[PDB]
């Protein structure tokens with residue numbers, strides 16, 4: 001019983017830059033970090049991946065309902081890494097998170113991608129509810145500017161008696177994936 | 181889960197810091213590497229840093245914490261890094277992997293203290309330290325070749341094989357832009373003018389950057405300058421006074437090829453390039469001659485590329501192919517190379533993490549960064 | 551046995567070759583990855599690695615099991631470091647790889663990373679293995 005009723009769209013940040021500020025406000029409310037960095041990370045969004053998608057609502061201005069970042073995956077042309085999935089705090093529990101992820105799948109599939117990957121710990125059941133499974137680690141490809149080169153016999157003593165499943169603070173994290 | 185922060189890139193020069201974000205194509209901040217202090221007479225603060233010291237340089241004495249590419253004043257250098265993070269970039273250093281640059285042949289104890297300060301004072305999560313010349317090569321779209329890095333305090337010949345500097349063949353020359361500025365002041369004063377102050381020094385630096393060039397045939401250019409006025413140019417000072425400059429235009433950067441002009445008895449950058457190449461593995465020498473890369477503000481003189489092609493040509497065997505590459509962007513190519521390296525897929529394994537530093541100590545830098 | 555170290559060095563998949571070599575009195579390859587390069591290190595190659603002419607191989611290069619390599623850093627006989635970093639040499643654009651050689655009381659620990667793997671990672675791994683065996687008076 002979480003049936004979103006609001007009219008929503010899903011657009012890249014770099015096509016609605018007047019909302020970049022509102023997007024930064026949204027994400028930094030969940031994951032506080034320097035506003036200089038959040039504005040820069042959203043400023044990297046581009047059609048070349050990584051790109052940041054905003055779930056937006058008609059109605060003074062449009063509301064930035066939710067955001068998710070999509071990056072390409074090293075050695076996996078058909079994989080996308082999903083990160084920074086968040087719905088506005090005051091709008092959680094209205095189905096906007098389900099629509100955000102489902103819209104991600106549509107967006108990715110239209111462009112030929114067939115596997116989404118992400119990490120979580122406390123929200124594992126949120127993703128399994130939407131079809132995700134436990135998978136293995138991938139490495140996302142970070143933003144590089146369009147202007148950069150882009151061309152690059154005695155016996156042995158005793159023995160000393162995958163950091164990819166760990167995150168920024170040394171916690172274990174679930175790698176989850178989904179075919180689309 | 182939240183995406184990981186983008187890495188910072190900080191290129192510490194003797195004259196200029198260039199700082200920005202890994203992946204961008206140009207630093208967001210470029211500011212002078214200075215700390216100023218009151219000449220005589222609270223005032224406001226015990227010290228003034230970077231852009232602030234610049235704006236107040238009238239009431240201040242300036243210190244350069246980096247001399248000839250080597251950090252020599254660690255308390256003031258700490259002040260510079262603090263200014264970079266919080267004042268110039270406006271980021272939290274504890275949130276970003278930080279890529280620093282070092283001068284070729286940086287002493288061991290220096291890069292140990294660099295790692296120590298970044299981890300223990302600024303609480304970075306991870307960091308790396310790269311050779312400036314190597315980054316310049318990456319910026320030129322290459323991984324092997326010899327780089328000529330001439331900035332404000334030091335000039336180096338750095339031969340590089342597959343992205344790894346070859347220290348045994350690095351050649352250092354304590355002559356760079358600041359010395360050339362001093363030299364131009366001197367001979368302009370010998371021309372009837374008077375440039376003798378630190379402020380007048382900055383003025384002469386602008387004169388040097390906007391009107392000097394490297395002659396292709398020095399003795400022939402001197403003759404032309406004595407025979408006519410075609411090479412004379414004028415410069416308007418901030419007070420409306422106008423000076424005119426003749427053969428000084430190309431006598432000044434000629435020092436790079438004839439250090440004896442400034443009283444140094446040492447080889448010119450062409451001879452040093454050649455000696456560097458000859459100290460390298462035979463099998464790669466040809467790749468060096470064909471990938472002579474220029475970096476640093478002091479290589480931006482009009483005519484330097486053609487002239488070092490000529491000189492190298494005359495020093496090298498008669499069949500060697502020689503190519504001199506001078507990217508138009510080489511004021512900042514060291515930083516651009518850092519942006520590249522820190523954005524590469526192969527780099528995630530290269531960072532020194534806070535946890536590698538806790539276990540191994542500052543010595544870890546000697547094992548992971550070269 | 552000694553082969554239990556080759557695997558202990560091969561386990562993380564970062565390296566394509568590894569070996570433990572004795573350099574005292576008469577050099578022998580104690581353990582190595584079969585079918586690779588280090589397994590065939592010759593006593594003359596050891597002698598060059600541990601010899602006194604620390605200058606010639608800079609312009610001449612050196613060989614490890616016959617593979618031509620270029621010397622990047624040489625600290626193999628200087629106390630506290632006991633390490634040497636190299637990069638292989640190839641023909642016709644074939645990939646090259648990073649090599650690190652560390653020296654202990656009786657053995658040379660050799661590691662060659664696979665394509666793309668940074669030489670500082672190989673250096674760390676080799677240094678830690680060498681420190682373990684020095685700790686055990688090897």
Ligand SMILES: CC(=O)SCCNC(=O)CCNC(=O)[C@H](O)C(C)(C)COP(=O)(O)OP(=O)(O)OC[C@H]1O[C@@H](n2cnc3c(N)ncnc32)[C@H](O)[C@@H]1OP(=O)(O)O
Nearest residue numbers: 001002086087092093094095096097098120121125126181
């Ligand atoms: C913690 C990590 O490591 S990864 C975390 C991913 N991002 C975040 O946690 C940011 C903070 N949280 C949020 O932004 C939101 O709570 C989100 C994006 C996780 C979910 O968005 P919401 O709007 O709150 O949930 P929504 O209303 O769309 O519910 C959609 C479905 O998922 C269910 N659901 C929502 N949250 C959870 C949850 N934490 N656990 C299990 N199920 C959940 C709902 O019951 C609902 O069921 P249904 O639609 O099939 O009937």
Ligand SMILES: Nc1ncnc2c1ncn2[C@@H]1O[C@H](COP(=O)(O)OP(=O)(O)OP(=O)(O)O)[C@@H](O)[C@H]1O
Nearest residue numbers: 193194195196249331332333334357358476477478
């Ligand atoms: N167009 C130009 N022509 C001549 N010289 C220039 C020009 N632009 C900058 N410079 C010189 O380059 C110098 C600064 O260059 P750069 O930033 O590469 O040096 P740095 O990195 O600060 O110092 P280091 O020598 O330690 O690298 C100054 O001395 C300046 O005079």
Ligand SMILES: C/C1=C/C(=O)O[C@@H]2C[C@@H](CC[C@H](C)/C=C\CC1)O[C@@](O)([C@@H]1CSC(=O)N1)C2
Nearest residue numbers: 195212213214234237332357358361381382385
């Ligand atoms: C425009 C500019 C160029 C530069 O390279 O800046 C550096 C750093 C500067 C510090 C003092 C100056 C008053 C402050 C800022 C000038 C920065 O010293 C320099 O001018 C020095 C002294 S003279 C010279 O040629 N190089 C160059």
Ligand SMILES: [Ca+2]
Nearest residue numbers: 192193312331
């Ligand atoms: Ca520099």
